[PDB]
Symmetry: D2
Subunit: 425 residues, 4 copies
């Protein structure tokens, strides 16, 4: 079903649904006061700016952001950086938190029980192709090249699949395909992830990116919402049901990936645990980042906050401040200290004589005089006191703060407030 | 404490808090799928555009909209018509729905238990004067003339009071004042509303508009949040506590009312029941409205939706359509029918041979051919079928639809869908 | 050169250039204080909302509006209704008025000498396909179906051509094509428009819509800007030069026309004279308009001004107001008068006892008591006095106001101010 | 005439008029392709963001920006950073370039002949107090404390005056006042600036900030526009005329100045010559700036451009980059070089082995490998080639580029393009 203009008409006949939804329990306390899509990233972004700017640059300007857990920061972010739309041009970012009445009802029992509470609003959009996006993930995808591959194949559901190492394939949806990219066997979060054919060390995993014939989705959820043994989830209940009827195809991600270096492999990081969050940000600080953010053909839209330039000033002794492979966003004030392999977000104040190495300083952090920081994640608005040392004694950082098994430290206000340090600057 | 520039500095040192909050159980099914602040009004407004445009024109550009019950329409309305702000100029409309975690917690136990869940966010605003607005009400108030009268008197709390007939004074907060506008006796929602001195037929009632010294509010809620017998409400728990310490003054509303005819009385309608909602809209349709909306010195900001002009066309027989004291907003298409004392909102389609009298047609209503409508409220998207008659047989309109004691009919999709009529045009 | 995704990539590689430019000397005094693209139309639109909303809905979000003559209203309109863009997403509406220095230089000698003054700014956009739009015209075109037909054919320039009656073909660019849609003979504004083959009563006319290979445009203007005998115009100088090299193809407009009734003919009105301006607006007032503006698949974006609903009130005698095939936009206040086949724009006040027939009342017009209006165009802010009669005595309307040869009257403030009538309400 | 609420009503009854207007011929080639109000400043600002954010924070939300010379950048900047207004709330930034018709007329003969061409538009605003702002100047003023001092005194015109050294008082309007702040003697740009009484080394100078009774301004310009010997300027023609009638008062700037350190003197820099432009930017780079831009009670609004964080990377040799009292805005990429006392604007790329000292690098500058820069101003988009040396040989920098008498160098593309260096990266 190939036509000259089909590539431009299908995004307009389409509607995206971001399951901002729940959290990552594996992100520890990075999330205790926010949703995982609203975790900061990149010096100025949040994670949901990746699953939203790919809808825009793919022509999909009708989005539906499903928010349940700690969404105040998320909703405020959509309000301030994603509310430039005009509903008359057939474009909008509708927020669909669970509707509360009688004071204790409607709380979204599953991933697919959140698209069923809102199934009277989504019909009104009159959409033929429903993209189902997990927006707690980081990528650069073109969903107007996955929609075609969906329309050429004559598919009803189209799961974006990409291979990953079998070691981490127990956290995603492993499938198995054929010569025509038809899903034969799908199993969600196995304990023994089956390998690919010819690639024993890797498994063909679902990314959480389903494209759906809308006439099939509505008839599949209402045919699923009445099920008493269902767990109400896309992976755990529906995609096996579609697969077992043979109506589920697989769309390889390398085809519909936007990357500035065609020789490279596609970039996917779901920032699962704490360690991959830290490792994902500092990749932007290296010399050749795996993720291009100086790209003008696929830009990422965010809250363009008004901040003054990054100021570097002399310390108390009149000396210089040295920097090496670091990002200093706007608002920062670094008073003559050494910053290495670091990422400083907005409004980070760093007083004199500090040493900062492989750190990520989320916004409004105040580092006090003579602090040493190594392999850490400093949370929002943390007021680090004077002479604090972090990342040199693992036995003394595990009983103060949180310390992952790989050596990454996390600092929060509650962790610092419990040691007596006042966090009200 | 009078200074030359005090009238301009206090709104900037101020923060408004709209308790969009719960519903009006007395509005019947007008509200079953929306909050009372999001009830439509005026052809193009919602009720919360009144409690928000008075903050803007009073200089208060920092608002806090507390939303709990059926807020999807409300939040979408704030997003599309109240998201032109820039957070750098010290201005914003923050939405503060209850934060949900663990799937069944944090549901706002009272009016004053919603400003206590959010008391870690409001401290961050660093506001000295907290205006506490009930935003389910209709008025034109200047809160930079109530803030001064609060600062001149040296008050800690300042309740906007206005007299109302003793008949309807059992639904508001009746107080009693002295020569210096100090509250002596406050009682919330009495069964026998005490009268005023010298005006036995009227009672001095609270409007739900408290101005607070912020250093006193925070210390009053935390001193109240620990109370086990409290009901967590401003009227029912706190304002008596302030009153009994003698720190509560009364600010007359006629002083800080914006009205284009100084000879008139101040305009306050809380659209309590169904009958006062209908009566309040048609007041705009009369020749001399009590509420001026063609006023340019105190304009009301709303979702400026892009709609085509109001089209009037000839009916099936080539005849004319007559109109008398009516409002026809944009999008409407009236095919040669008689419309009298009516208010038609956006996108109301009225086919031929209809007769419409003292009606209010909320948006996207479709009236079919040969319909007669008298003293009714047609809800959103109601698809009235052909030959329907409403408002001529009270015994036949009470057992089909809802009919108030005063004779006002209300029509909803669920009422029409239950009689077999398909509402999917 | 056909590829799966070519239909979506070419608008993003493209840049549109609207020649808002000069005026229509044939519009008489409708234009004396504005550019022809800023002439009002449709109850709420201006003409340049047609040549701009077709770029948006065609994916072309980089526009260049070239303005020279009386552009204050035009520029203010772009500012208030076309400034929702974010320059980071590769989208903008750049205004390119002639750059003034030394107080009397740089005044745009021709249509193609306005794209040559600005040829240092347009290179910076890095565009491969330059659409050249005359934006003083009314249509609904999809320029992402003309760009392909340009890329399939391997063309360098692609002129959108559509047939018109030979009677009015002396005002457009008549061409002649072959079996492959190659322009053979082009002549601009002939005195004897050549006819089509097989259609002696019609001529194949240029619409003023050129698509250009950018590498060819820049090399064609700089190769033309040095010409001393050139008149610096697209039609009169360049398109013959391209044609005579055989690099100019013709793109039929019926292919790339957006119309809701496929059985109909394409809609093109350049509102040439006064009579076609009046006739073009009232077409929207008829029962079946030739131009669909209740279309949601190709909406027109404009200045969504905040106006109250259209109010109809009783006259001084308590009587009704009748309407027949008319458009009443927002702000209007019609006090019980008869309005027929009319178009009332925003904020038109019509006092009692008026009779209005086949009129067009541009905004902020005040009609006084007992006025009769027939076949007229009332300009902006005209304060028609009491008892004025228009359109019943042609000999008495030609020596007061302007009256076309076909019987259309035009009323301006200067025409009314010269008869003594004060126009300062 | 003192009333409780007068401080808040007068800005709303007011209208500001920024004379963005002509250029500074003394800024040399900084301006050759832009107006002086659009000169960059501060890392991210332009100069007209100072004369506009003081209207906003002073409550004056109706501005009129008069633009004549090279306004493409200025108008584009107003469009993208000052077009968040809604005309219904009585707020706007109207652009008033001279209206062009017949191709060579209407070119604004003087400063006060630009408010007379536009005197039919300004009457429509219905403003009582017209602030007349020169917007090519840098300050932090509160015009709602100058308007009162104007209304208390019962003045007709109110000139903001502040003392400056008699050495530079030949470029401003020197006046002389009395005990009641009444102007006695005004003379514009004298050759021998008269001194103050008791301060022989300083002169009481006009800042170009006139507040006017609107009923007097309109009657003063029309009474001046007919004068054949007038030069059509506020200083040179009108203010002497008002002064000689005794209707002109003087408003001291230290009263209505917003400064975070009350012990300091008011900040006024008109960035007259090249040397004061350079000296004015680096003041922001010092440790204690004279101009506070980290102030939240009087923020400056600008084009909040979306730029990535400031990246510092290692040079070709793996080494560190050192910084000392510098501002690095967003977009910059500094590859391991030394930056001192500098100001880098957006998108400045600095390759390896550079040395940059007391420089100002306007946006999109590319510094090549092994460059030494000292006491310079690098203009927009300058592509400095490899091994260039600037600021070490004054005899070799005066015959290449422009070099002021005080030692400041200025680098432009035309200066670099004339030495053969290609500026097309
Ligand atoms: N300056 C601050 N100090 C303390 N908490 C903050 C600050 N800014 C934001 N927060 C809170 O930090 C939590 C996470 O917000 P965010 O980091 O924006 O996702 C929320 O509870 C915010 O209200
Ligand atoms: N065209 C429509 N048809 C049916 N329901 C609608 C329509 N538009 C809005 N609604 C719903 O009507 C309820 C009230 O919305 P509102 O009238 O906008 O407050 C909500 O549940 C909306 O989703
Ligand atoms: N209410 C009004 N009264 C008189 N002239 C106006 C009014 N509104 C706009 N204009 C002027 O009418 C001319 C045409 O403006 P427009 O009709 O908006 O293109 C311009 O000179 C405007 O400044
Ligand atoms: N990247 C660039 N390269 C060359 N010229 C530019 C660039 N950006 C802006 N300009 C021009 O530089 C002049 C000054 O612009 P601005 O610096 O923005 O005031 C104008 O003629 C602009 O069009």
């Amino acid at each position: 079903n190939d036509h000259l203009m089909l590539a431009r008409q299908l995004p307009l006949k389409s509607v995206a649904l971001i399951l901002a939804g729940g959290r990552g329990t594996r992100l520890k306390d990075l999330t205790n006061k926010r949703a995982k899509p609203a975790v900061h990233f990149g010096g100025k972004f949040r994670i949901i700016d990746f699953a939203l700017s790919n809808c825009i640059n793919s022509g999909i300007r009708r989005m539906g952001v499903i928010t349940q857990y700690q969404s105040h920061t998320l909703v405020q972010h959509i309000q301030r950086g994603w509310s430039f739309f005009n509903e008359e041009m057939n474009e909008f970012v509708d927020l669909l938190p669970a509707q509360q009445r009688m004071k204790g009802e409607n709380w979204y029992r599953g991933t697919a029980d959140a698209v069923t509470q809102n199934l009277d609003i989504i019909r009104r959009y009159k959409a033929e192709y429903v993209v189902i996006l997990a927006g707690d993930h980081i990528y650069k995808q073109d969903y107007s090249r996955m929609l075609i591959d969906h329309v050429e194949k004559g598919a009803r559901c189209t799961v974006a699949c990409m291979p990953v190492p079998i070691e981490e394939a127990s956290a995603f949806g492993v499938m198995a395909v054929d010569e025509n990219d038809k899903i034969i066997e799908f199993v969600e979060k196995p304990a023994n992830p089956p390998s690919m054919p010819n690639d024993p060390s890797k498994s063909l995993a679902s990314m959480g990116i389903y494209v759906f014939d809308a006439d099939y989705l509505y008839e599949l959820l209402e045919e699923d919402d009445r099920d008493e043994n269902s767990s109400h989830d896309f992976g755990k209940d529906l995609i096996p049901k579609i697969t077992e009827a043979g109506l589920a195809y697989a769309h390889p991600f390398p085809l519909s990936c936007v990357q500035s270096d065609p020789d490279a492999e596609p970039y996917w990081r779901d920032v699962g645990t704490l360690e991959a969050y830290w490792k994902a940000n500092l990749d932007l600080a290296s010399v050749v980042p795996e993720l291009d953010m100086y790209d003008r053909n696929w830009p990422i839209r965010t809250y363009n906050e008004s901040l003054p330039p990054a100021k570097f000033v002399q310390d108390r002794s009149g000396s210089h401040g040295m920097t090496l492979n670091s990002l200093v966003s706007g608002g920062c004030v670094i008073s003559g200290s050494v910053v290495v392999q670091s990422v400083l977000f907005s409004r980070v104040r760093v007083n004199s004589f500090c040493n900062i190495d492989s750190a990520v300083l989320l916004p409004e952090v105040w580092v006090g005089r003579s602090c040493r920081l190594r392999r850490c994640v400093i949370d929002r608005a943390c007021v680090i006191p004077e002479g604090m040392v972090i990342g040199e004694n693992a036995e003394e950082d595990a009983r103060r703060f949180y310390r992952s098994e790989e050596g990454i430290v996390l600092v929060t206000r509650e962790m610092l407030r419990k040691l007596g340090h006042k966090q009200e600057r």
